[PDB]
Every structure is written in C-alpha cells, then in structure tokens.
Amino acid sequence: SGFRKMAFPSGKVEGCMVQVTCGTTTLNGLWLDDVVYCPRHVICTSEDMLNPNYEDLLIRKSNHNFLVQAGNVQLRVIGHSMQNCVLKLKVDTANPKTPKYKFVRIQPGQTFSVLACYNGSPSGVYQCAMRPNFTIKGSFLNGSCGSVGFNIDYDCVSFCYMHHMELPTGVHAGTDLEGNFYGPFVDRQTAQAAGTDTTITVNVLAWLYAAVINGDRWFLNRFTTTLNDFNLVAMKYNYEPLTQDHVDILGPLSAQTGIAVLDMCASLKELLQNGMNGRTILGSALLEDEFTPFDVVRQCSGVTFQ
Amino acid sequence: SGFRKMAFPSGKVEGCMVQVTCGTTTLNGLWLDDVVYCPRHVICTSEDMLNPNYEDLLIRKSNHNFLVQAGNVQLRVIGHSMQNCVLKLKVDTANPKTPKYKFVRIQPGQTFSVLACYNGSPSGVYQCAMRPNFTIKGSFLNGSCGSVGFNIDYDCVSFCYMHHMELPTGVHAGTDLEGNFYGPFVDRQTAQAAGTDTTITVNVLAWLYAAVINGDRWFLNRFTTTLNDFNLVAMKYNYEPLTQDHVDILGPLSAQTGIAVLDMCASLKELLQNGMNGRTILGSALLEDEFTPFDVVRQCSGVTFQ
Ligand SMILES: [Cl-]
Numbered sequence: 001s002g003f004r005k006m007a008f009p010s011g012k013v014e015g016c017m018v019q020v021t022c023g024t025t026t027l028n029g030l031w032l033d034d035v036v037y038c039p040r041h042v043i044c045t046s047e048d049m050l051n052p053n054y055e056d057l058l059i060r061k062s063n064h065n066f067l068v069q070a071g072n073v074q075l076r077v078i079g080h081s082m083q084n085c086v087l088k089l090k091v092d093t094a095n096p097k098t099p100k101y102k103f104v105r106i107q108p109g110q111t112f113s114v115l116a117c118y119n120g121s122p123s124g125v126y127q128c129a130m131r132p133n134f135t136i137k138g139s140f141l142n143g144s145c146g147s148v149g150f151n152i153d154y155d156c157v158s159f160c161y162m163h164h165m166e167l168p169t170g171v172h173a174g175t176d177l178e179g180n181f182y183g184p185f186v187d188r189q190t191a192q193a194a195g196t197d198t199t200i201t202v203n204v205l206a207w208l209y210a211a212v213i214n215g216d217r218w219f220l221n222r223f224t225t226t227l228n229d230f231n232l233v234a235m236k237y238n239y240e241p242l243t244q245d246h247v248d249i250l251g252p253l254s255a256q257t258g259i260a261v262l263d264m265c266a267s268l269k270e271l272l273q274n275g276m277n278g279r280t281i282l283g284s285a286l287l288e289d290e291f292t293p294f295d296v297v298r299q300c301s302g303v304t305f306q
Numbered sequence: 307s308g309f310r311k312m313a314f315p316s317g318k319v320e321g322c323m324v325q326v327t328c329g330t331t332t333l334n335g336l337w338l339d340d341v342v343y344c345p346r347h348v349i350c351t352s353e354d355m356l357n358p359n360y361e362d363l364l365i366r367k368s369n370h371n372f373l374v375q376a377g378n379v380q381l382r383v384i385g386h387s388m389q390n391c392v393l394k395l396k397v398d399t400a401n402p403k404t405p406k407y408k409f410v411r412i413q414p415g416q417t418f419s420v421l422a423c424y425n426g427s428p429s430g431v432y433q434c435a436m437r438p439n440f441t442i443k444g445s446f447l448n449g450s451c452g453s454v455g456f457n458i459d460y461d462c463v464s465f466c467y468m469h470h471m472e473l474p475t476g477v478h479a480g481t482d483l484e485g486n487f488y489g490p491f492v493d494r495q496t497a498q499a500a501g502t503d504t505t506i507t508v509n510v511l512a513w514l515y516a517a518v519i520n521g522d523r524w525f526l527n528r529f530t531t532t533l534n535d536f537n538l539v540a541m542k543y544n545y546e547p548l549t550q551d552h553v554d555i556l557g558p559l560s561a562q563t564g565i566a567v568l569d570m571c572a573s574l575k576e577l578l579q580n581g582m583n584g585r586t587i588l589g590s591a592l593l594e595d596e597f598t599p600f601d602v603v604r605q606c607s608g609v610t611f612q
Contacts, residue, residue, distance in 0.1 A: 001445075002446055002476070004443075004444065004445040005432065006431065006432045006445065007313060008430060009421070009429075010431070011317040071612075116312070118608045121611065122315040122611060122612075123608060123611070124315065125313050125314075126311065138310065140308055141607075141608040142608075170308070215476065280592075284591075286590075286591050302422075302447040302449065302450070304427045304429045
C-alpha cells in the first residue's frame with residue numbers, strides 16, 4: 001500500500017553525464033554514442049547573455065576550445081555543430097555505457113524525472129510535470145544547466161528535456177534534445193512572460209482514483225454530473241477543460257474501482273465549491289495534479305524496468 | 307531556485323539488487339562482495355507467517371534450496387547463515403559492481419532514499435523519513451520486501467534500511483542491515499501497535515528556513531519566544547520537544563538568513579495557534595517535517611556525489 005511521488009531509477013542516465021567547459025563557462029552535457037549534447041550558451045560570458053548572436057560567437061571557437069571530461073578521462077573533440085539551441089560536439093571515443101534510448105518531445109500535462117547535476121556529477125533525482133504554460137517547478141542552482149529529464153519504458157531511456165534557464169519569476173524553462181524550446185521562451189537573459197497557468201484536471205482525477213484505491217474515501221458523494229456542467233465549474237476555478245479522450249484514458253481506473261468517471265467529476269466539483277474543510281487526502285491538504293493516469297496505474301501494479 | 311523532495315541517485319544501489327527464491331517465495335536481496343542479504347521470511351509459506359519458528363524452518367533448507375539470479379547470471383551458494391532477521395547467503399562469485407559502502411543504524415528523524423524493487427529489478431526511488439515511532443510511510447506492494455533504504459556521502463553508500471512488512475494500519479516496518487528491527491515490531495503476521503506519532507519539530511524549522519531562502523516570508527512575525535514557552539505550545543500540538551542540540555544544528559541556517567532560531571520558534575507557534583489561513587508555503591498547505599537541516603543545506607548549496 002502507500003502512495004509516494006516516485007522518480008524513475010537514475011543508473012542508466014548517470015553513466016552519460018559529462019562536464020563541458022568552454023572558456024570560463026562550465027555546464028553539464030550528455031554523452032551518447034560518439035556525440036556530446038549541451039546548451040549552446042556554454043560559449044557565452046555573463047555579459048553576452050544580455051543579447052547574444054550565437055552564430056558570430058561560434059565562428060570564433062574551434063574544436064580545441066571545447067574541453068570535455070568524463071570522471072578522469074578526457075574526450076577529444078573532432079567536430080562541432082549547432083542545432084537550434086543545443087551544441088553537438090563530435091568526439092573520438094564512443095561511450096561504452098550508452099543505453100538504448102530515444103529523444104521525445106512530450107506534451108503539457110506529461111510527467112518526467114529530472115537528474116540534477118553540477119559539473120557533470122549527479123546530485124539527486126525528482127519527479128515533476130510540464131505545466132500547461134510549458135514551465136516547470138524545479139530545484140536548479142547555478143551550474144545546473146544541461147541537466148536532463150527522461151522517462152524509462154522497459155529498458156529504453158526516452159530523453160525529453162534539457163534545462164537552460166531560470167525565469168525572473170523563480171520558475172524554470174528548457175528545450176527538447178533537438179534544441180527546441182518548450183513554450184515562448186528564448187535563451188536571452190531578458191524578462192519573459194509565462195502565460196496564466198491552469199490545474200491539470202485529468203491528473204487531479206487520476207490522483208482521486210489513487211486515494212480510493214488506498215482507502216481514503218470521505219470525498220465520495222451521492223450526487224452526479226454531466227461533462228458540460230462539470231466544465232463550467234472547472235473553468236471558473238481555472239482548471240483545464242475535460243475532453244472525451246481524457247475520460248477514455250481514465251477507463252482502467254474507473255473499472256478497477258467501479259466508480260464511473262462522471263461520478264468522480266461530481267466528487268471533484270464539490271471539493272472545488274466547498275474546499276477540503278480541514279481534512280486531508282493521501283496526506284495532502286491541496287488537490288495534487290502531478291501524477292498521470294499511467295503513473296498511478298504503474299505505481300499500483302508495480303511494473304519495474306530492466 | 308526552487309525546492310523539491312529529492313532522492314539520492316540510484317545507480318550504485320541498482321547494480322547490487324538480486325532476486326532470491328526459496329521454494330515458491332521470491333523476494334529481493336542485496337549482493338555485496340561475495341554475500342547476499344535478504345529477509346529471512348523468504349523460507350516461509352503464507353501459512354508459516356502466522357507463527358514461524360525460524361530455527362526449525364531453516365534446519366530443513368540446504369544450500370541448493372536457495373536460487374539467486376542477477377539478470378541472467380546465476381550465483382551458486384556455498385554457505386548460509388542467519389543473523390537476527392536477515393539471511394546471509396555466501397556465493398562463489400564476488401559482485402564486480404560493488405560500491406564502497408557501510409551499514410548504519412539511523413535515528414528517528416533522519417531521512418533516506420528507498421529504491422523500490424519487485425523480483426530483483428528496480429521500479430522507482432523516493433525520499434522519506436524514519437518517523438518518531440519507528441515506522442515509515444512508503445509505497446510497497448507484494449514482492450517489494452528486501453528493498454533497501456540508503457544515503458550517499460561523497461562516493462560511499464551507507465545502507466540503513468531493509469523492508470520486511472506492512473502493518474494492518476497501512477504503514478511499513480523493517481530492519482537495519484544486521485537484521486535488527488526498528489521499533490517494537492517482529493516478523494510474525496499478527497496485529498501490532500505503533501505508538502502515537504509526533505511531528506519532527508527540528509525538521510519543520512529546517513523547512514521554514516528553506517522557504518525564507520526561496521522568497522516565501524509572509525509567516526515572519528514581530529514577536530519572539532523562549533524555549534520553555536515554545537515547548538509548552540508544541541507539546542499540546544503533539545510536536546517533538548526542542549533541545550539545545552537542535553538549536554545548535556540549526557545554526558548555519560540561522561546565520562545565512564540572519565533570523566535567530568528563537569525568532570523562528572515564535573513564527574511557528576503562531577502557525578500552530580492560527581493555522582495557515584488558506585495561504586501556502588513552498589506550495590504546501592501543511593507543515594512539512596521530511597527535510598533535515600543537512601538536507602536543506604545540501605539542496606541549497608548543490609553538493610553532488612561521485
Ligand atoms: Cl499539502
């Protein structure tokens with residue numbers, strides 16, 4: 001029993017984390033096959049970051065200007081190339097501890113595990129969510145840049161995120177592994193507006209099914225609701241609108257608990273309108289939106305990776 | 307910036323997790339040097355668990371009755387021995403991926419990372435705390451037993467906990483690596499009483515310093531308090547009594563934020579007496595007691611392991 005916020009195991013990602021230094025600037029990079037990926041702002045000074053021209057800045061650098069060190073071994077750089085906002089540094093040796101892997105661009109609402117790294121060595125791991133406004137609420141100090149977010153299926157590491165920058169608001173932003181930003185953000189140090197955030201409705205529901213499965217059931221109501229009615233309430237509490245695809249995805253959980261989705265939607269609406277009234281759910285006094293329906297399922301059936 | 311509930315990296319522990327099977331019963335074991343550690347209830351049937359005599363049950367088994375498989379490779383067992391509630395199975399091969407390590411018996415209040423495993427392969431990792439009544443609030447399904455909790459300092463893995471059983475109350479219990487239970491619990495399937503729990507005062511304070519460090523400051527008050535006065539309030543809200551050792555441990559945080567401990571104790575007392583009043587702190591509507599003062603420090607200075 002029990003319900004925790006769990007991350008994937010970090011073994012396979014740990015053996016790919018290298019330290020990249022170019023001039024003074026040092027940040028983390030990801031060594032797969034014979035290539036190293038890092039944020040392209042490793043060629044900038046603190047001053048450059050105000051308004052960089054990345055083309056012109058790169059024209060100055062040569063292969064020997066990029067130092068890459070894995071533990072104690074030093075890689076030698078043979079080529080270098082710029083794809084969107086990441087740099088791809090070709091090296092002479094292929095990584096012996098390279099796992100099977102893909103690169104994937106996720107959607108808002110999806111969750112993933114972040115391995116937090118300073119100077120190419122690992123600090124810690126945590127689970128988190130791509131918000132609806134494409135930010136994330138991390139824990140990232142100076143030097144953290146180039147830490148990666150990933151998922152594990154079976155034995156295949158799916159890299160979804162690379163950390164680039166902190167916003168003035170205290171929140172985080174970044175790219176996929178081909179160098180494209182999630183959201184409107186750019187790698188210039190200027191004031192940038194994240195839109196209004198919303199709560200991820202489909203995930204709050206997933207978490208309610210987890211509470212029932214674990215024995216916490218006080219929020220269950222006699223009443224019931226329709227989709228369109230439920231969505232009118234949601235909207236005024238800045239919740240994400242619920243579609244049929246979302247109901248469909250909640251099916252397995254509705255079956256094993258025998259509580260129809262719309263009956264759960266009615267339970268939620270009351271919580272929105274009356275608050276929790278000083279009770280708790282899975283030990284939280286707020287409504288948690290950072291487990292997907294696949295997360296809850298996996299946590300409850302105990303899937304395992306290898 | 308940011309503050310997450312973070313676990314240590316799991317790489318080094320993952321390469322020690324084996325599957326132990328004895329008769330029908332399969333559970334997880336830990337392969338270091340030439341020895342495998344597992345829960346001694348791997349020699350029990352579901353029926354035995356009601357009132358087992360572990361001596362007599364073991365006298366029946368021989369080396370060849372214990373099957374140990376790491377991935378695809380099979381170990382051969384040369385000896386077997388029972389120390390308190392764990393079994394030590396001597397094998398012919400030493401583990402090539404054995405990290406430097408110790409075994410440590412922690413104290414209530416300490417935190418640690420759990421690697422959750424079914425059938426010798428890893429599922430996920432999370433941070434948690436030894437409660438004052440020596441239980442823990444995990445996420446553990448059937449088959450989980452023999453999962454380990456650990457800390458990492460520098461490059462040295464310190465194993466502190468092995469999972470044995472779930473209590474009827476929905477909470478978890480277990481042993482150190484020499485086989486001694488934390489708390490009053492025994493490995494018999496019977497009803498067992500955990501005492502009254504308390505909130506870990508020193509840790510709530512640590513977490514308040516983390517909120518100030520991150521910019522959340524509304525709970526700061528003009529007032530102030532004494533130790534003895536603060537402890538009279540605490541007690542009636544079932545908080546752990548604060549000693550001078552606890553103040554001493556909070557020193558570094560008091561310095562860098564320039565808020566004296568007793569001033570923080572006064573802030574807390576008001577929260578106890580007036581609630582949070584529908585505000586949040588680091589995004590929580592409750593008072594969090596699962597970061598130590600060493601945790602917060604480490605998270606805020608970005609220490610790293612290697
Ligand atoms: Cl909460």
